[PDB]
Design an enzyme around this catalytic site. Structure first.
Site, PDB file in Angstrom:
ATOM      1  CG  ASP A 225      -6.251   8.518   1.918  1.00  0.00           C
ATOM      2  OD1 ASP A 225      -6.102   7.356   1.972  1.00  0.00           O
ATOM      3  OD2 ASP A 225      -6.038   9.554   2.631  1.00  0.00           O
ATOM      4  CB  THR A 226      -5.371   7.066  -5.340  1.00  0.00           C
ATOM      5  OG1 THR A 226      -5.504   5.979  -5.044  1.00  0.00           O
ATOM      6  CG2 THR A 226      -3.956   7.293  -5.508  1.00  0.00           C
TER       7      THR A 226
ATOM      8  NE  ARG B 275      -3.651  -2.824   2.311  1.00  0.00           N
ATOM      9  CZ  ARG B 275      -4.294  -1.747   1.956  1.00  0.00           C
ATOM     10  NH1 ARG B 275      -4.751  -1.799   0.588  1.00  0.00           N
ATOM     11  NH2 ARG B 275      -4.914  -1.034   2.883  1.00  0.00           N
TER      12      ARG B 275
ATOM     13  NE  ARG C 298      -3.724   2.464   0.817  1.00  0.00           N
ATOM     14  CZ  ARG C 298      -3.662   3.740   1.114  1.00  0.00           C
ATOM     15  NH1 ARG C 298      -2.467   4.210   0.495  1.00  0.00           N
ATOM     16  NH2 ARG C 298      -4.569   4.802   1.257  1.00  0.00           N
TER      17      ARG C 298
END
EC number: 3.1.31.1
Length: 135
Positions: free
Chosen positions: A34-35, A81, A29
């Site tokens: 933040d996309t 992740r 990650r």
């Protein structure tokens, strides 16, 4: 913080890539960003999601060298992740997304916050240029 080599396996979304790290496939990650996503219910494919996802994909698929950089704190999240800054030929992917208005700086959890101010600066410049998310 030191960089370590990795090999692309598959780009998964704007904020997630699968890499071969120390001989094992692992989902990473991207730290501090933040996309808009393509992969999440309720919403589904959010606005600028396909765009952020295509940006990350091209950037890692066209690279000669991928490097991962873990921060000072925890290196995995509750989903297994890896949490890291990802570099494509020397260029930080996390920062590139932010500079292009394709991601926002996330909520930050110390001490995984080493590159926070640098990203925040890129984010301030993308809002000013009213790029993408900021348009």
């Amino acid at each position: 913080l030191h960089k370590e080599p990795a090999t692309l396996i598959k780009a998964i979304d704007g904020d997630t890539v699968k890499l071969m790290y120390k001989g094992q496939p692992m989902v990473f990650r991207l730290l501090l960003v933040d996309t808009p996503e393509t992969k999440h219910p309720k919403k589904g494919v959010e606005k600028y999601g396909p765009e952020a996802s295509a940006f990350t994909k091209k950037m890692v698929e066209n690279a000669k060298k991928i490097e991962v950089e873990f921060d000072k704190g925890q290196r995995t999240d509750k989903y297994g992740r890896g949490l890291a800054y990802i570099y494509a030929d020397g260029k930080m992917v996390n920062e590139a997304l932010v500079r292009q208005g394709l991601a926002k700086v996330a909520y930050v959890y110390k001490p995984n916050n080493t590159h926070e101010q640098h990203l925040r600066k890129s984010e301030a410049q993308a809002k000013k240029e009213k790029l993408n998310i900021w348009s």
